[PDB]
Design an enzyme around this catalytic site. Sequence first.
Site: not given
Lengths: 316, 316
Positions: A13-14, A131, A216, A278
Amino acid sequence: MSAGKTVVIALGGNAMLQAKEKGDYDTQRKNVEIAASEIYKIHKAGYKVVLTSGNGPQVGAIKLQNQAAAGVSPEMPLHVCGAMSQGFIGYMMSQAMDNVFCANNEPANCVTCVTQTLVDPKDQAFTNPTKPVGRFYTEQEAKDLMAANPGKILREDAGRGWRVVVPSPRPLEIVEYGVIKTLIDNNVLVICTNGGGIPCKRENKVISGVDAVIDKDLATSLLAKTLNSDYLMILTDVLNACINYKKPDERKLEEIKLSEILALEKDGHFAAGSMGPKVRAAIEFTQATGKMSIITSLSTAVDALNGKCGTRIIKD
Amino acid sequence: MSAGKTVVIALGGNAMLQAKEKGDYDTQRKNVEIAASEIYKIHKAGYKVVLTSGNGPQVGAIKLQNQAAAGVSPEMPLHVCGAMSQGFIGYMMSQAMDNVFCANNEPANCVTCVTQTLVDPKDQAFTNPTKPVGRFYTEQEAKDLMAANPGKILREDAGRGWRVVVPSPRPLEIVEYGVIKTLIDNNVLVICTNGGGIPCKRENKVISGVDAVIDKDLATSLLAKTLNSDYLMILTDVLNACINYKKPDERKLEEIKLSEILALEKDGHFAAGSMGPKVRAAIEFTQATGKMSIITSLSTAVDALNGKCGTRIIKD
């Protein structure tokens, strides 16, 4: 270049939004130029690049606009909204990516590919939306919003606010894999599977979109192994996986064997946390290919490829 | 497959929106599936195919949606709506194409590429908006709509309808040309340049978007020329290009030489209607490359390639 190892890199997102920033076009684009500049160093270093990303905030916004303008323009399904978001996000990335190339006197070859991801129609996630997507509401706005819309539903993102959730089933297959491989084979910098790819299902020879948003990271891991790539990087804003954050015995993770990390993932050291999937993503890939996976910040991407920082999970 | 000649085809609106159709997804989907099955014939016949399209209704809808929700979520500029429409159209298209492929037990390799197109910020297009996007309003609605929205302009179009109108500068450069070639060299069914490509400018070696919608026919011609394609194929619902139709002396262009049709355009025969820029673009292709261009209905596309119908423009 024909000689390079391949790295599959997943922007977060960053790469588009900074902590609680507003999502006007000019804001997001600037952050995308920032990431491009870091990505270019990896390509300059001679690696072949596949670039993915998430689309939480961006797909959320598209859906919001589809509902807001419903009385005046036909509202598109979530899966269609994702498609549009890959158009948005892909365009930003390739344009930024071309601009750095040109600034460095390299001729541009990079494309974004529209990406469909197959999923299971009977995935538990289709009866239980995990989500978070879009921007944050507040309990009053949120606990209300099930007033006119009982079917819609929000969830705690702890402090930052209340967010729409939706089915987030397991990625089973990247429909376009074959074409992506072909592109990298030819030394094209590929942008694909942005937001984890358009969730679809396939039954009786037919593919069609399902309303959902795929993870993702799990998606990227999926791609990286089907690609049998050399590295998988997830890039966050946490330069680092940490055990025991906020602790006297906070142990930051560096180059770790597959053994410890896979065990720590049943000390449940990452369970509740942005870093859960992740980790699973990384493990899933290293586990499946014996190749190195990395979790680090945008800031230190090349640094982690040169073994100077970042959590890098290693084969056993 | 390695030996096919290359045909670059431009789908129209009929690919997605009929007359008086409302632009919900299900409607567009089914239409696109129609085009796809036609297009597959060509692929099956052994041609290498690049598919493009318009985006007038679709980008128009996305634009309408951004305006209407500007108080609920940041409104995106038109070129971003462009990108978004590529995301959407490319998705319907390649998912549709993938399904014809599979119905025919041939494994998929089709992609959609996000596409940027360079134009000149000093084009007359900008001073003078003339390209219709979105849905048709009655003449009243347009009056009212314009009062209520000063910046906005609508014009009568197609004989029956008022429509929002935008800059339509010349396409000068298909940014992702190199990659598009690479893909067709590797026998990928490539979808790209949807809506004519995302309108951009380049100044001081920086690409950035401009607010516009390029003519898809001109853009497809440019790409066909850059690719050194064997054929340029423009699709419509109009059977053929007819001069004076419903007028006893009707002359329906079939096969025909460059210089001939060249001088009709000089005499203003296609001065009105949709066919003006279609012929212009067809002329530009054959003038430059000497290869055949073709204007015909979707239903008779394979027929046309097989020298048996449609307006086929030929070099002298």
